[PDB]
Amino acid sequence: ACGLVASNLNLKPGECLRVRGEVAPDAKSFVLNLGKDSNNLCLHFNPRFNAHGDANTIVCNSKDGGAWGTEQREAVFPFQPGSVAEVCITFDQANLTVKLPDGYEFKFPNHLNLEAINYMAADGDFKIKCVAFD
Amino acid sequence: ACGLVASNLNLKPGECLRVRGEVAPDAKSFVLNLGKDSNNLCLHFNPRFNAHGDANTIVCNSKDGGAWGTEQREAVFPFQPGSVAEVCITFDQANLTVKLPDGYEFKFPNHLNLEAINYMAADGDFKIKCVAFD
């Protein structure tokens, strides 16, 4: 029961990927994967409301050659179940910059040093309503 | 490989799929494919500015199990090279409807009778900049 999957995004550095979606009223978690393909993700965005013992916490990671990297969590959680949310993503050689709903912003190291983001896959309790490329 | 490819769209009857893109300045033609998957297309939207023996003419067709159906040709050609084009697509038991802001709208028989559009692909001189679902 997965969601949107888009390839050939060809998102270059500095370019902004904007994703707007509807967070389910009883959402437990949702995921946005970005990278080259399903085995090579420069970013695994997985805001968790309550799903893996975790409660209202944003979990980030990367996957290189099928291998998950060292997980990373953010303190803030600007996501409300039953509400519409937008996340804006960009990157450079050193970091991916993720801009969340209430202005909050954070960087995730660009572990794969990807030339461009060509793959995106959404999953979970987040119904994509709009996706804008640069 | 080509332009943006998106799957798992899960567009249902009546729901509007809006696509905004940039037509290349040297646009010879561009394609918007909609269907179940790459081999099952309820709509192959192909405006041809100057491709094949065609000039400034829209060609539409379907694809069933990999086999192309019979093409349909339009007289109206509301497209221009090096410009932003916007299309609004929907469907029902009878036809697929492609609308433009100018007021132009094309109808193509729903040959496959699919009850959902899960696949969308862009090819040619059309770069997708935004896609909105329902």
UniProtKB/Swiss-Prot annotation, chains A, B:
The gene is LGALS1. GO terms for cellular component: collagen-containing extracellular matrix; cytoplasm; cytosol; endoplasmic reticulum lumen; extracellular exosome; extracellular region; extracellular space; galectin complex. Gene3D superfamilies: 2.60.120.200. GO terms for biological process: apoptotic process; cell-cell adhesion; myoblast differentiation; negative regulation of T-helper 17 cell lineage commitment; plasma cell differentiation; positive regulation of apoptotic process; positive regulation of canonical NF-kappaB signal transduction; positive regulation of inflammatory response. Homodimer. Binds LGALS3BP. Interacts with CD2, CD3, CD4, CD6, CD7, CD43, ALCAM and CD45. Interacts with laminin (via poly-N-acetyllactosamine). Interacts with SUSD2. Interacts with cargo receptor TMED10; the interaction mediates the translocation from the cytoplasm into the ERGIC (endoplasmic reticulum-Golgi intermediate compartment) and thereby secretion. Interacts with CD69. The keyword Phosphoprotein applies. InterPro entries: ConA-like_dom_sf, Galectin-like, Galectin_CRD. The modification N6-succinyllysine is found at residue 107. The modification Phosphoserine is found at residue 29. The modification N6-acetyllysine is found at residues 12, 28, 107, 127. This is Galectin-1. Lectin that binds beta-galactoside and a wide array of complex carbohydrates. Plays a role in regulating apoptosis, cell proliferation and cell differentiation. Inhibits CD45 protein phosphatase activity and therefore the dephosphorylation of Lyn kinase. Strong inducer of T-cell apoptosis. Plays a negative role in Th17 cell differentiation via activation of the receptor CD69. Disulfide bonds: none annotated. Residues 3-134 form the Galectin domain. A beta-D-galactoside binds at residues 44-48, 52, 61, 68-71. Keywords: Acetylation, Apoptosis, Cytoplasm, Extracellular matrix, Lectin, Phosphoprotein, Secreted.
